[PDB]
């Protein structure tokens, strides 16, 4: 029944972070210059790190859609956990997001400061990333127990 709201709750919350990963990243990505450089790779890393954040909720939303049925058992009330399920997954992606840029916007610049540190921010970003990974796990567990 209403747990279907969680289906929404997934990306509307997930995409939210995933955006503020992109934007806060890019605003720094303007500088410093030298559009030539062969990477052009590290510059995307934050974005795509923040990118798959959106992927997360999708998967969540995907799973939560399918298990959801217009005319299938629920109201006694089966699907109720599914509400948690998405929102569970969600803030992590969000939590991930507010991190990403917050590191990213300075992170991209940091390459201009110390390109030999390029490994470092990554080490922060990967933890800065993993947050969503947990929630999703929790999310899938839920719908897995979702019946």
């Amino acid at each position: 029944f209403f747990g279907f709201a969680g289906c929404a709750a997934a990306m509307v919350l997930s995409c939210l972070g995933a955006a503020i990963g992109t934007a806060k990243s890019g605003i720094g990505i303007a500088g410093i210059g030298t559009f030539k450089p062969e990477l052009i790779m590290k510059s995307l890393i934050p974005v795509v790190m923040s990118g798959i954040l959106a992927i997360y909720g999708l998967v969540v939303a995907v799973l939560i859609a399918g298990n959801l049925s217009p005319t299938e058992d629920y109201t006694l009330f089966n699907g109720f956990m599914h509400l948690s399920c998405g929102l569970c997954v969600g803030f992590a992606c969000l939590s991930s997001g507010y991190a990403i840029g917050m590191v990213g916007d300075v992170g991209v610049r940091k390459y201009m400061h110390q390109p030999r540190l390029f490994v470092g921010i990554v080490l922060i970003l990967i933890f800065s990333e993993v947050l969503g990974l947990y929630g999703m796990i929790v999310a899938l567990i839920l719908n897995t127990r979702g019946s």
């Binding site: 956990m81 948690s84 569970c88 991190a99 917050m102 922060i124 800065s128 947050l131 839920l142 127990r145």
Partner: protein
């Protein structure tokens, strides 16, 4: 017969994740200064365990009690978790900033947060016992 408290399950990891998020946030902005973030996440790590353990107990049926037990068992972690970050975050900026000048005293700035991140530990402790007690109901 609501079994609603499972909203607790998420509620654990929700503020939890926020903790290291903000925690790592003010942490990042070399090989030494990762340590706060390295210390930071474990709260999130703590988060999953809680929601996990709660999930398996949750069940389509329940009795409204254990839900309540489940409820706020996360808040134990989560609220603390957010706090833990808030602790880490302020710290996570400071230790690095000062280390710039002098790369010695970090031993404390590693210890201060070391005294800090046990905040979360209390949550799980609090949390676990709740699940430890979530049985026996009826």
């Amino acid at each position: 017969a609501p079994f609603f408290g499972a909203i607790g399950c998420a509620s654990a990891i929700i503020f939890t994740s926020l903790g290291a998020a903000y925690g790592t946030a003010k942490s990042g902005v070399l090989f030494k200064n990762i340590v706060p973030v390295i210390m930071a996440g474990i709260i999130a790590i703590y988060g999953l365990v809680v929601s996990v353990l709660v999930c398996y107990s949750l069940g389509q049926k329940q009795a409204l009690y254990t839900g309540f037990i489940q409820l706020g068992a996360g808040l134990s972690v989560g609220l603390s978790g957010l706090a833990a970050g808030f602790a880490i975050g302020i710290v996570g900026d400071a230790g690095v900033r000062g280390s710039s000048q002098q790369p010695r005293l970090f031993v404390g700035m590693i210890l201060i947060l070391i005294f800090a991140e046990v905040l979360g530990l209390y949550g799980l402790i609090v949390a676990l016992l709740l699940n430890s007690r979530a049985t026996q109901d009826v």
